[PDB]
């Protein structure tokens, strides 16, 4: 079975309301055997709702849900920062003529907040690493919102392409910001051939790009 | 009333692998039990179910490659012809219609690549650079395989301001990740910052002290 959920992201400010829809390709067992879950990265899912509308023990009454047959909705009222996460529906079906269960595709909830510019830090490679023949230069963009950001790497003012990778944290459960790390990987051979290493950051919260830089060895 | 999975590890394709879900405080004859998986960055996927009396059912996509069985204290998942598309975290859960109790998951990697332990390098707090009365420092955990690595700071006592980034797969096929923390600049002289890195797949354990450069 295929359960199709609201496309990601669904977004709301704190104190506002969001809804997430779940459509099953076939009617669920007894028309109401449908459950809802919250998951944060690195954690197992947490049950919110079962039998399409029953609140699970210990779950906030801010969560409510309804539906029947093939059509179901989860409503999160009075949205709070720690609602950021991914929500799944699970259909339960007649095992004799179908798969017993299936998961919807998941819907990410993003908590809105004021624009926040990143704080930027640059880290030269350590001497210990350089002994190994590689150099990693790290640029940290901390606690910004929204998620969209641009990092450009320059080596002696020459723009780099294809030798950096970046990673982004999940939206923070307490302040609703993101952080990002970009790593520029060079051979030690190339690294020792140049002086000025610079990370240039573009973000909606900055009136003009911010550059952090160092000179090799200083 | 708890579940804990074990057995996740690196195997080559076609090598069979058994995962174990150990139950505590549950009578397994009274509950259907379920296995679910989640590939990195992807959604949850139902694999199958063992019913109260021991009958089993599986997802159509599984094509007989998964077998669930149980004892009075455990539920096993045996995977018989794994491929790279079976790399995922595998969860056991209590329930047949819906899932109220979950394990923490166990990570299975299907690959022909070799185990490699990471090197741990400091991201040294700048001697002369702040972005708000705050300094940043961290550890770079480079060139390991398979996942996962864990990072704590000061044996878990330091949690505020910590960002441990998702691992990135490099072109070499090895993972790297950074863990950073923002701290008061005034603390750099007096406070000790140690990143505790563990890569169990290679029995690599490193406690690296991060300090300003001279």
């Amino acid at each position: 079975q295929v359960l199709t959920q609201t496309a990601s992201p669904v977004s709301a400010a704190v104190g506002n309301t969001v809804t997430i829809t779940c459509q099953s390709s076939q009617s669920v067992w007894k028309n109401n055997d449908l459950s809802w879950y919250q998951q944060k990265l690195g954690q197992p899912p947490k049950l919110l709702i079962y039998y399409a509308s029953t609140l699970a023990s210990g779950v906030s009454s801010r969560f409510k849900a309804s539906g029947s047959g093939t059509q179901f909705t989860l409503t999160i009222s009075d949205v709070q920062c720690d609602d950021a996460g991914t929500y799944y529906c699970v259909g339960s079906y007649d095992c004799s003529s179908a798969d017993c269960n299936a998961f919807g595709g998941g819907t990410k909830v993003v908590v809105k907040r004021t624009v926040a510019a990143p704080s930027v830090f640059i880290f030269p490679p350590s001497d210990e690493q350089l002994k190994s023949g590689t150099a990693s230069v790290v640029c940290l963009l901390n606690n910004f919102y929204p998620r969209e950001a641009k990092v450009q790497w320059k080596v002696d003012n020459a723009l780099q392409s294809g030798n950096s990778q970046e990673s982004v944290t999940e939206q923070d459960s307490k302040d609703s910001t993101y952080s990002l790390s970009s790593t520029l990987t060079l051979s030690k051979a190339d690294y020792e051939k140049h002086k000025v290493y610079a990370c240039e950051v573009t973000h909606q919260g900055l009136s003009s790009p911010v550059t952090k830089s160092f000179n090799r060895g200083e | 009333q708890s579940e804990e999975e074990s057995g996740g590890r690196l195997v080559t394709p076609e090598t069979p692998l058994t995962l174990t879900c150990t139950a505590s405080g549950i009578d397994l004859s009274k509950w259907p039990m379920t296995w679910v998986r989640q590939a990195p960055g992807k959604g949850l996927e139902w694999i199958g179910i063992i019913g109260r009396s021991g009958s089993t059912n599986y997802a159509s996509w599984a094509k007989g490659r998964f077998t669930i069985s149980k004892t009075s204290t455990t539920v096993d998942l045996k995977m018989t012809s794994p491929t790279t598309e079976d790399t995922a975290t595998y969860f056991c859960a209590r329930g047949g219609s819906y899932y109220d109790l979950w394990g923490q998951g166990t990570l299975v990697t299907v690959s022909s690549a070799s185990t490699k332990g990471p090197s741990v390098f400091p991201l040294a707090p700048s001697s002369k650079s702040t972005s708000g009365g705050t300094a940043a420092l961290g550890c770079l955990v480079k060139d390991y395989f398979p996942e996962p690595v864990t990072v704590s700071w000061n044996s878990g006592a330091l949690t505020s301001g910590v960002h441990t980034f998702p691992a990135v797969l490099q072109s070499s096929g090895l993972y790297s990740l950074s863990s950073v923390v923002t701290v008061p600049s005034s603390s750099l002289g007096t406070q000790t910052y140690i990143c505790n890195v563990n890569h169990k797949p290679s029995n690599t354990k490193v406690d690296k002290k991060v300090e300003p450069k001279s």
């Binding site: 007649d94 095992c95 004799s96 | 509950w31 259907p32 019913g51 009396s53 009958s55 059912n57 047949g96």
Partner: peptide, 10 residues
């Protein structure tokens, strides 16, 4: 056998 519901549902 056993009813599907007593086996697989809760």
């Amino acid at each position: 056998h056993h009813p599907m519901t007593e086996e697989f549902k809760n």
